[PDB]
């Protein structure tokens, strides 16, 4: 749901068509003060595809951190590594828990929604 939905575009002097500026109006009512969606498809493409790879890494990681912020995972992480011609591999790991606290003395704090089993 996060990766495959466009987030709001950034304000440019050019502007955007009233209907193309991405996002979801339902974000006007949530209370956690965040946005909905990702922006991997809004990278400012450039030459030297290594820089594009780094940019897409930053965007994907910033967007997937919302899994931890919501309290559904704990250590989501990406392993985006290739340059090819345009091909890129972006395996994603979503670290989860179980529905019964079986370990004592952890550094962090049990995710708030460990009932989904993550």
């Amino acid at each position: 749901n996060i990766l495959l939905t466009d987030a709001s575009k950034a304000d440019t002097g050019c502007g955007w068509t009233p209907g193309n500026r991405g996002g979801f109006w339902g974000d006007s009512f949530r209370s956690d003060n965040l946005r909905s969606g990702s922006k991997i498809r809004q990278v400012p493409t450039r030459t030297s595809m290594r820089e594009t790879v780094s940019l897409i890494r930053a965007y994907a990681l910033d967007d997937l951190k919302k899994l931890v912020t919501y309290g559904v995972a704990k250590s989501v992480d990406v392993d985006l590594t290739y340059r090819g011609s345009n091909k890129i591999d972006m395996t994603v790991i979503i670290q989860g828990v179980d529905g019964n606290e079986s370990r004592v003395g952890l550094t962090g704090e049990r995710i708030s929604n460990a009932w989904v089993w993550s």
Binding site: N1, I2, T5, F24, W25, G26, F29, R30, D32, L34, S36, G37, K66, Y70, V72, N113, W115
Partner: peptide, 18 residues
């Protein structure tokens, strides 16, 4: 009684009903 986790299908269903 589960919370409505944002950006999940229940979030969109609730938005649609509203």
């Amino acid at each position: 009684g589960a919370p409505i986790i944002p950006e999940s299908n229940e979030f969109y269903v609730v938005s649609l009903e509203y």
